[PDB]
Design a binder for these strands. Structure first.
Ligand SMILES: Nc1ncnc2c1ncn2[C@@H]1O[C@H](COP(=O)(O)OP(=O)(O)O)[C@@H](O)[C@H]1O
Ligand SMILES: Nc1ncnc2c1ncn2[C@@H]1O[C@H](COP(=O)(O)OP(=O)(O)O)[C@@H](O)[C@H]1O
Ligand code: ALF
Ligand code: ALF
Ligand SMILES: [Zn+2]
Ligand SMILES: [Zn+2]
Lengths: 673, 673
RNA sequence: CAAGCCGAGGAGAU
RNA sequence: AUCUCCUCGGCUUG
RNA sequence: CAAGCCGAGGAGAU
RNA sequence: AUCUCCUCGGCUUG
């Protein structure tokens, strides 16, 4: 039942017989089916050759593993050969090393294979080796970067290949190397100004993957052009001339606070430079142990945030954010009670809270023209996607769609999607919820999906009529991927952003980067085999050598590991909180203090299933981890300061591993009875 | 007359002189006779040593106690020493504490000993202590888990041992500790990915049992391999491609109901996630007190059940289940009479009942291939067991065997067996009936026994030629036990399940778990005695400490016990049903309401020797318990809602003890005259 | 034979 | 940690 | 479902 | 090289 198209067979012909290559075709070009056919043919050849046929497939995202196992690989190849799909969400309850030699076909995330190989090197597990495989297939090869995971596996393979090459001249016996196939659409450019540098980057990618070709379609290119229709470009610009009253009032309170705390800004208000200066002042206050510096800096950062989102988000969201932050602060202080500067800030906000609320309520936007374009397009159509910067922006957009009655009149369905993980005050989503949202959009129940960069990569959809980016541009690879994600016969590509910012210049930069992409692929494809191979060998040895010395330097970097040489103090108040030995380590990951003498210092607080800790000052410290029954008080070094026993050089790390000195584990015999 | 085999003596030699150990041999390896010989030798040594010899045997199942008392222990050891067999079914009319010091040999379920020790601690009874015994023997040691009953007894013993160890350094006098012997075949793995974690689990088991060895046969292993023949593996797969017409019609009515009640599914149809969402909506409706939510959710759950069994059961059973459920509902409503949505559901079923019956009657299965394999094997043989998920599945299989004429032509005898207890709409069986069925199968009168997980553990049979699992896999321990239960010279092991499900992956996972078992036992057996003992002591103190703080937390959890602070309302209709004090408690277990004012609210209903109660809405509430003459109306909190006097936070418990506030007992003087 | 109560174990999904 | 689904033992009542 | 830990990638500013 | 801001994967705990 397997089917092929003339361009598919043309591109895949070299790979049918050896030729460990890369295939760079646009999105929705059957690349998945090309890989499926190549796998089927390779396994058929292995069976005909009376040789073991092992195929492994690597995908950076967890979801794409299930997607391939469900839609392309298993349905077409279920009957002939055994198939299994592995992932972090999936419980590989059997093992990796033997399932390698059980099902003859593996689809797994790269990190699992990497972990298995590291375990083998450590010797704890029997482990697996690349020799066990006969064919390695990689999706989204552009991620093979300086030391990405794909790059780690490929560096191991390339060290093996270099050893094999050395033996070729030294000794006949050699370790077999599986064939390598890579699939991508935009290999990418490492921000290279010179087309020489662009082709250098392309050759670096090839060397990392040992591609020895790109093998792009040239004959049936007209057929592809007919098949795939590029979306129509559209540029939208805006100016934040309005918002004067409330913005001016907010700036006035900013200036009042700044003069109260005499902060020479050393930058213009409303920029990342100002936030960096504020954080540097945070650090300086930590090294000096004074107040009046960190609280005001954090408040200014929050107001700057509010302003930046306001340029792209409605005020109500910013005001709610600020109100929640101040509510949390007030609850902290109220719990602690049970200075004139914190009082100044809080009482200033309380006194002006009503007037600020009324002032934000008044009129005086990108939002009005965004609504105009969206509804005009929807009537002109009788799917849509929004790409933005931060998750709260997606939530605000969803709220705007729901509340506004015009969208209800149109009846467009919408839902907010965001990435997983905890990212500094954005709620972590769950993978199952992401799969649910994607499936709901696929079945047509959701007509408008708002997503962050997550949807840019993978997250394939059969068609997406409308792709409207909203103030998001990062690089050419993301731009091209998002553009190709439309896959609709009649697509509409729109970019919305402020004219003052450099975002339009960035979009045209990405356009030229795409053009330079092709300008470099066509060049590299036409190169002398001898000089070409010399370049690949050079780049391969470069990568291997760099990795070797990187490992050496990492070994040489972390060596001190002293038992106890410091005193840990509260950052807000320079008081002796803990010694260099009273701390204990559990699970080899978490830190705790068990002596009750500490319990007389900190204050437990719980308002919400794990409580938290706070200082006498109100500074948050950590949580109460319920492990093995024990409610161990875990503390985050992110909210503490260190004082070495000698010279008292105060240092703040935000992180434990950055501290070279180690702490002892918790001996449960100590807490006997 | 006692006999031993070289592997038996080899494994038992360490235990002959002290050495409180575990013995892990495959099934049917004489383990029972090994225990009998060890007991006999120990008692002979005690007599020769002029010391009291007390032996106690613990079995988790009630039936195995009688089995050991009948087949292995008493017949061989009747003459030399007194023997008695205790159990829940058996009436220990004398007492436990003195029969400990009466017959010199005890065979009892662990729970009885546990209860006696708890009574001793409470002081109500004179009680018994482990010191009274000289040897404790445990069967199926793998059940010694986080706080299993075996684990509770072993934790008490280990606290005693820790006290004795402390005295060893402090004071010469110490409390003697009886020797400990354990018998098992598959100690098990706690779903451990790392062989380090597997051996950690094994060491945890040893510490709980103080085994200090495993002592597995290594020398005569060839003799065991020759003696015991492993069954031949066989994998059977199927796809539910058929069933399209009636399944599609059922899905259509599902969709009609869902759109009528606008249930955003938040999951795919036909999965436990959908049922969980339905129950969450049950809870939400309870907190809001609206209809149109719970009835439809329950109907959808019933249809989802029907579908799931249909994948593995004939439709007629599902249709009969649905028909009985709707008949019960209609009888409820008819009794109540003597909304448009309940009417919608019931009238929809009535209108389509004839067409649904005809549609289920038509053709379009795992059943056909199951019948094929069963009959082909039976002719190829000229006993059989089926393991399944739910009891109604066993009943359907028995009906299929009886009705189908092909089995009659073969003449295979078959009967259905299931576990005891009430498990949410599956009839509770009786222990005597289970013993009857087992004896009938043993005597050869039954050639095919269908059983649930109950037959997996214990329920020993001299031989079982055929073991065919049918869509049942839970863990490696159950798999290995069932596999070894065959014990036939020429066995046939078969696993039948759908290809779409992950059941085959599970079976191979259990296979690798068995392999990892041996990979960990061989490792632990070869360990340094000092480091080993350090690990056992560590794990023992861990268990003791965890149990201590668990008891402390349990004490700290249940403290409120308020007399009357709530109002109890009907879940279906938010009406005031009872106050916080009008309820009374009897037998210290049952709850009742005595005031006749309540009798004017609920409706008594009886259709069948205890009647039941229903609301004005038709919601079932409870029964009429005939205790001490009184027909007290007992109500199940499972079908009610609570409303606290303050803040009215509605909460549903399904259970009484979960409610921390207590109710008064029934004072019979109140109901005088 | 029926009903009820207390605890415990395993699997699946959040 | 939670929810669902299955299984074991002990106790009581009739 | 919640929390925590390890690594990695991209963009911006010094 | 540093700081900031965003995203991915793996692990653990409950
Ligand atoms: N052999 C073929 N015959 C007909 N159509 C094909 C064939 N191969 C691919 N296609 C078309 O190309 C598309 C393949 O998209 P796909 O490769 O899954 O996108 P992506 O690679 O981005 O996941 C399908 O929508 C299908 O209609
Ligand atoms: N000393 C012996 N001499 C001969 N045969 C023995 C001896 N001990 C055990 N056997 C054989 O081993 C089997 C023991 O099975 P048994 O231990 O009762 O199974 P389980 O332990 O699963 O209940 C018997 O069928 C018997 O033939
Ligand atoms: F392989 Al794609 F979108 F190009 F999933
Ligand atoms: F002791 Al057995 F089956 F192994 F009863
Ligand atoms: Zn402080
Ligand atoms: Zn009611």
């Amino acid at each position: 039942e397997l089917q092929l198209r003339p361009y598919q067979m043309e591109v895949a012909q070299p790979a049918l017989d050896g030729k460990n290559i890369i295939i760079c075709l646009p999105t929705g070009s059957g690349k998945t089916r090309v890989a499926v056919y190549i796998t089927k043919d390779h396994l058929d050849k292995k069976k005909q050759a009376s040789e073991s046929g092992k195929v492994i497939v690597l995908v950076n995202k967890v979801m794409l593993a299930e997607q391939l196992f469900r839609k392309e690989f298993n349905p077409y190849l279920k009957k002939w050969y055994r198939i299994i799909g592995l992932s972090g969400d999936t419980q590989l309850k059997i093992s990796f090393p033997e399932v390698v030699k059980s099902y003859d076909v593996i689809i797994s995330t790269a990190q699992i294979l990497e972990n298995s190989l590291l375990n083998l090197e450590s010797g704890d597990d029997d482990g697996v080796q690349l020799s066990d495989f006969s064919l390695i297939i990689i999706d989204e090869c552009h991620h093979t970067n300086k030391e990405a995971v794909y790059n780690n596996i490929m560096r191991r393979y390339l060290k093996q290949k270099l050893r094999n090459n050395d033996l070729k001249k030294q000794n006949k016996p050699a370790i077999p190397l599986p064939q390598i196939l890579g699939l991508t659409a935009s290999p990418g450019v490492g921000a290279a100004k010179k087309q020489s540098e662009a082709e250098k980057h392309i050759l670096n990618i090839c060397a990392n993957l040992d591609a020895f070709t790109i093998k792009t379609v040239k004959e049936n290119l007209g057929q592809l052009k007919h098949q795939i229709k590029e979306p129509c470009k559209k540029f939208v610009i805006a100016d934040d001339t309005r918002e004067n009253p409330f913005k001016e009032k907010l700036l006035e309170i900013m200036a009042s606070i700044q003069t109260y705390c005499q902060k020479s800004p050393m930058s213009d208000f409303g920029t990342q430079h100002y936030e960096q200066w504020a954080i540097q002042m945070e650090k300086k206050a930590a090294k000096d142990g004074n107040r009046k510096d960190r609280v005001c800096a954090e408040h200014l950062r929050k107001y700057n945030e509010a302003l930046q989102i306001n340029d792209t988000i409605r005020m109500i969201d910013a005001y709610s954010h600020l109100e929640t932050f101040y509510t949390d602060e007030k609850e902290k202080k109220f719990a602690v009670l049970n200075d004139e500067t914190d009082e100044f800030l809080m009482n200033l906000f309380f006194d002006n809270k009503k007037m600020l609320k009324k002032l934000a309520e008044n009129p005086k936007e990108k939002l009005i023209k965004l609504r105009n374009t969206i509804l005009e397009q929807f009537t002109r159509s009788e799917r849509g996607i929004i790409f933005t910067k931060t998750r709260q922006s997606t939530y605000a957009l969803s709220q705007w769609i729901m509340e506004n009655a015009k969208f209800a009149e149109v009846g467009v369905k919408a839902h907010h999607l965001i990435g997983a993980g905890h990212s500094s005050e954005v709620k972590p989503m769950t993978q199952t919820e992401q799969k649910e949202v994607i499936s709901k959009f696929r079945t047509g129940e959701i007509n408008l999906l708002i997503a962050t960069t997550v949807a840019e990569e993978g997250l394939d959809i059969k068609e997406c009529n409308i792709v409207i980016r909203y103030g998001l541009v990062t690089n050419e690879i993301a731009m091209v991927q998002a553009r190709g994600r439309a896959r609709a016969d009649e697509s509409t590509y729109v970019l919305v952003t402020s004219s003052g910012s450099g975002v339009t210049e960035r979009e045209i930069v990405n356009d030229f980067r795409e053009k330079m992409m092709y300008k470099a692929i066509n060049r590299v494809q036409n190169m002398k085999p001898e000089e070409y191979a010399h370049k690949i060998l050079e780049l391969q040895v470069q990568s291997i050598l760099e990795k070797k010395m990187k490992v050496k330097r990492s070994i040489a970097k972390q060596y001190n590991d002293n038992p106890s040489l410091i005193t840990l103090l509260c950052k807000n108040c320079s008081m002796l909180v803990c010694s260099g030995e009273n701390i204990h380590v559990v699970e080899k990951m978490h830190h705790v203090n068990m002596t009750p003498e500490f319990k007389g210092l900190y204050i437990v607080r719980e308002n919400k299933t794990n409580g938290e800790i706070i200082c006498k000052c109100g500074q948050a410290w950590g949580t109460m981890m319920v492990h093995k029954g024990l409610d161990l008080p875990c503390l985050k070094i992110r909210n503490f300061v260190v004082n070495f026993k000698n010279n008292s050089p105060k240092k703040q790390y935000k992180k434990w591993v950055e501290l070279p000195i180690r702490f002892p584990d918790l001996d449960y015999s100590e807490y006997c009875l």
